[PDB]
C-alpha cells in the first residue's frame, strides 16, 4: 500500500538525520510511525536526563566565550528599533522584508546599525582597536524555504581602527569556523547595503556575509575609521552541524526541541 | 553658581552608585562633568581589558546553569507570537500594553503561553515531573518610570505533575534568590490572568509573580495536571544587585554598557 502526502509529511517530521529508514519500503504507515515515535521519545528522554541545554542557547554561549576570550566586548542591544534606521542603512523603499511595529518602529533585520552606533560611541573611550560582537534575534519576512526563517538568530562581530584588513577578517572567520568544526570557502558577492561582500559558503549554503570597510554608508553613521565585520546565522550553523534537512529544526519553535519533534 | 536641569541630568547620567559626589556643592559643572567622565572612561576601559561580558548576557548564563543543574529543560521559544494568544490568556480587551506586529501577530508580553504549550507537549514524552524554563525578551507598552522597560528580559521556570505545591515553589524561589544573594519576602497579590499570586518583593520592588495551579485558564491551554511557575525580570534583578537608581541602566540599550553611560 502507498503512503499519502499527509502520511509522508508526518514521518518526515519524526525522522532524524541519523536514521536510515525507507519510508516507501511497503511497511505500513502505522509501523513506521510507531518506530519513529519510539526513537524520538527515547531521544527526548535522554536529553532531559543528561544534557538539558537548548541547541541555540548552547551555541550562543559557546560563540560568546570564543569572542570574549579573543578581546571582543559582548553587546546586547535593542531588538525593537527605530524604523528610521532602515532608510538610513540604504535599504531603499529587502525593504518589503521588514516587520513594522506601531508606526515608527520595526523589528531589527540585522545587528549592524546598533553595532555601528556602539563602535562610534566606544571609540571615544576605549583604546584602539575597538572589538565588539552581538548575538541575538533578527527578523525578516521571507518566502518559505529550507534555509530561511522569519525569526532567526544573528552573530555579528566587528572591529574598528587598526587591524581592519581583509586578511585579518579572513583569519578571524577561519579561527571561528575551525573552532566549530565547519568547513567553508570564501566567494565574492554583493549586496544593496554594504556593496561587495566576502560570503562564507558551506557548499551552496551561505553562512555569512562579511565586509571590509570603509564604505560610503559610514558617513551617515559617524564611522570615520577602517573597520571589518561579519554576520552569521546561528540556525544555519546548527543546520550544518546536525545535518538537518530544513532549517526549521534549528529555530525557536514550539514544534521541535533540539531537532526532535515535540508532536509525540 | 547653580546647576540647570539639563546640567543635573547630564551629571546623573555619568554618576554611578559607588560614587559619593555632591552635585550641588558649588563646584562648577565643568569640573563635576570632567571628574565623572574620567571615572566612567576608567570603568569602561577596565571592563574592556578584564571582563568583557554583558551584565544581561552573563546573568542569563548564570541563571541557565542554575536551572539546568536542577533538572529543568532550557527552552528558547518564539518572541513574535500569534495575537490570538492574548485573548486566550484572559487578557480582556494590559491589553493596551501589547505591541502589535502586522495584523495577526504581536511581541510576547510574557513567556507563559509558550511554556504552557511546551508543558502540554512534553508531558506526552517525558517522565513526571516536567520541569522547564525560559529566559528571553518580552515587550509591554509602559508609562515611563524607574522600574519598567518596554523591552525587558523575563525568566520563567515552571513544573507540572508531582511536586507542584506552594512549599516546593517557595523553596525553589528561595534557593534561586539565595544563589544570587538577593534578600526578599513573599506577599500575596492578584492579577487578571492568573488570579492569586505569590509576589516576591525586595522592599517595594516586585521581583516576581509566582502561581500555584491549577487555575481555570488551564483548560483553554490543555493543561490538566498540577503545576507551579514563576516569572522574574532580569533587569530588576540587576537593579537590585548593582543598586541602580533607574532600571534603564540595566536594559538593552545603546545608552549604557553594564550601567556605564556610553555618551563619553
Ligand atoms: N531569513 C533568514 N533565516 C536564517 N538565517 C538568515 C536569514 N537571513 C540571513 N540569515 C543569516 O544571516 C547572515 C547575514 O545576513 P545577510 O543579510 O548576509 O543574509 P542574506 O545575504 O540575505 O542571506 P540569503 O541570501 O541566504 O537570503 C546570512 O549569511 C545568514 O547566515
Ligand atoms: N515593563 C517591565 N519592565 C521590567 N520588568 C518587568 C516589566 N513587567 C514585568 N516585569 C518583570 O516580570 C515579572 C513578571 O511579570 P508580571 O506580569 O508579574 O509583572 P507585573 O505584575 O505587571 O509587574 P508590575 O506590577 O511591576 O508592573 C515582574 O515581577 C517583573 O520582575
Ligand atoms: N551601516 N553602517 N555602517 C557600519 C559601519 C561600520 C561598522 C558597522 C558594523 O556592522 C557590521 O558589521 N557590518 C558588517 C555586517 C555584514 C552582515 C550584514 N547582516 C549584511 O546584510 O551583509 C556598520
Ligand atoms: N496560560 N496558562 N496556563 C498555564 C498553565 C500551566 C503552566 C503555565 C506556565 O507558565 C507559567 O508559569 N505561569 C506562571 C507565570 C507567572 C508570571 C506571569 N508573567 C504573570 O503575568 O503573573 C501556564
Ligand atoms: K534520515
Ligand atoms: K552615587
Ligand atoms: Mg536574504
Ligand atoms: Mg545572500
Ligand atoms: Mg549575505
Ligand atoms: Mg505591569
Ligand atoms: Mg504587579
Ligand atoms: Mg506581577
UniProtKB/Swiss-Prot annotation, chains A, B:
Family: Belongs to the class-II aminoacyl-tRNA synthetase family.
Gene that this sequence comes from: pylS
Organism: Methanosarcina mazei (strain ATCC BAA-159 / DSM 3647 / Goe1 / Go1 / JCM 11833 / OCM 88)
Name assigned to this protein: Pyrrolysine--tRNA ligase
Gene Ontology MF, one: ATP binding
Enzyme Commission number(s) of this protein: 6.1.1.26
SS bonds (residue pairs): none
Keywords per UniProt: Aminoacyl-tRNA synthetase, ATP-binding, Cytoplasm, Ligase, Nucleotide-binding, Protein biosynthesis
GO cellular component: cytoplasm
Entry's Gene Ontology BP terms: tRNA aminoacylation for protein translation
Annotated catalysed reactions: tRNA(Pyl) + L-pyrrolysine + ATP = L-pyrrolysyl-tRNA(Pyl) + AMP + diphosphate
Protein role: Catalyzes the attachment of pyrrolysine to tRNA(Pyl). Pyrrolysine is a lysine derivative encoded by the termination codon UAG.
Cellular location(s): Cytoplasm
Amino acid at each position: 500500500p502507498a503512503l499519502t502526502k499527509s502520511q509522508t509529511d508526518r514521518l518526515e517530521v519524526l525522522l532524524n538525520p541519523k536514521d536510515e529508514i525507507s519510508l516507501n519500503s511497503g511497511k505500513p504507515f502505522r509501523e513506521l510511525e510507531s518506530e519513529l515515535l519510539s526513537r524520538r521519545k527515547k531521544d527526548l528522554q535522554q536529553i532531559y536526563a543528561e544534557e538539558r541545554e537548548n541547541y541555540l542557547g548552547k551555541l550562543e554561549r559557546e560563540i560568546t566565550r570564543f569572542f570574549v576570550d579573543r578581546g571582543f566586548l559582548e553587546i546586547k542591544s535593542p531588538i525593537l528599533i527605530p524604523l528610521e534606521y532602515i532608510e538610513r542603512m540604504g535599504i531603499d523603499n529587502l525593504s518589503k522584508q521588514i516587520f513594522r511595529v506601531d508606526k515608527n518602529f520595526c523589528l531589527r533585520p540585522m545587528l549592524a546599525p546598533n553595532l555601528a552606533n556602539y563602535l562610534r560611541k566606544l571609540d571615544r573611550a576605549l583604546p584602539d582597536p575597538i572589538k565588539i560582537f552581538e548575538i541575538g534575534p533578527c527578523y525578516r519576512k521571507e518566502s518559505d524555504g529550507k534555509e530561511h526563517l522569519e525569526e532567526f538568530t544573528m552573530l555579528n562581530f566587528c572591529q574598528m581602527g587598526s587591524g581592519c584588513t581583509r586578511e585579518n577578517l579572513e583569519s578571524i572567520i577561519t579561527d571561528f569556523l575551525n573552532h566549530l568544526g565547519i568547513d567553508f570557502k570564501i566567494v565574492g558577492d554583493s549586496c544593496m547595503v554594504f556593496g561587495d561582500t566576502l560570503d562564507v559558503m558551506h557548499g551552496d549554503l551561505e553562512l555569512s556575509s562579511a565586509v571590509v570597510g570603509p564604505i560610503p554608508l559610514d558617513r551617515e553613521w559617524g564611522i570615520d575609521k577602517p573597520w571589518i565585520g561579519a554576520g552569521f546565522g546561528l540556525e544555519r550553523l546548527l543546520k550544518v552541524k546536525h545535518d538537518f534537512k530544513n532549517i526549521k529544526r534549528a529555530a525557536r519553535s514550539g514544534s521541535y526541541y533540539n531537532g526532535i519533534s515535540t508532536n509525540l
